[PDB]
Amino acid sequence: MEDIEAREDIEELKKKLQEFGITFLDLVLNVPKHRDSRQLCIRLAKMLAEDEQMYNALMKNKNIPRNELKKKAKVHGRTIGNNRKYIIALCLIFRSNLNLSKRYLEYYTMLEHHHHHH
Amino acid sequence: SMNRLGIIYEIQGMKAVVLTSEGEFLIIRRRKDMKVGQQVSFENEDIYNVRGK
């Protein structure tokens, strides 16, 4: 009932990040400056987790399947590379026991119901 | 004067890496109510800077 995540699950996520060479500090460095950017980056991570083939490629390569992400997201490879560690983290969250953080990320990315930056 | 709600992902000494309500992993000022895995409602002014260049 309670909306808490377990430290053991948080750090289990971290153990996965350690396999990629990512810390929680790396994530802060890769944090997008504004809303447009972060909705976009978390959305990339979302579709990367939404697809099993992409997620499995991500795990085995320890890097994002950049070409496959680029064809589905229609983003720049430069976007992918700059936010790579960050995108990996959220992707992992959507498929990891971090259901509350999943919920935070999912509700934030669905907020593109009106999204024109002008 | 601006609240951000988030989830605590790591305690790092006197600071903590938390998620914000925008999914940002940001370092804020460590508090009493902090435990890795719990939620925290903090100020945007608790947020540190990594400083980027």
Mind explaining what this structure looks like?
The PDB classes it as transcription. The entry lists the keywords sigma factor, transcription. Chain A is mainly alpha-helical and 118 residues long. Chain A has one domain. Helix content of chain A is 70%, strand content 0%. In chain A, helix 1 (7-20) packs across helix 7, helix 3 (35-50) packs across helix 7 and helix 7 (84-95) crosses helix 8 (99-109). Chain A is globular and about 40 Å long. By secondary structure, chain B is mostly beta strands. Chain B has one domain (1-53). Chain B has strands at 3-12, 15-19, 25-29, 39-43. Chain B has a 4-stranded antiparallel sheet, with no helix packed on it. Chain B is globular. The chains are: A mainly alpha (118), B mainly beta (53). Chains A and B meet through helix 1, helix 2, helix 3, helix 7 and helix 8 of A and strand 1 and strand 3 of B.
Strand-helix topology:
The complex is a heterodimer of chains A (118) and B (53).
Chain A: H1 7-20, H2 24-29, H3 35-50, H4 52-61, H5 66-73, H6 77-82, H7 84-95, H8 99-109
Chain B: E1 3-12, E2 15-19, E3 25-29, E4 39-43
Antiparallel strand pairs in B: 1-2, 1-4, 2-3
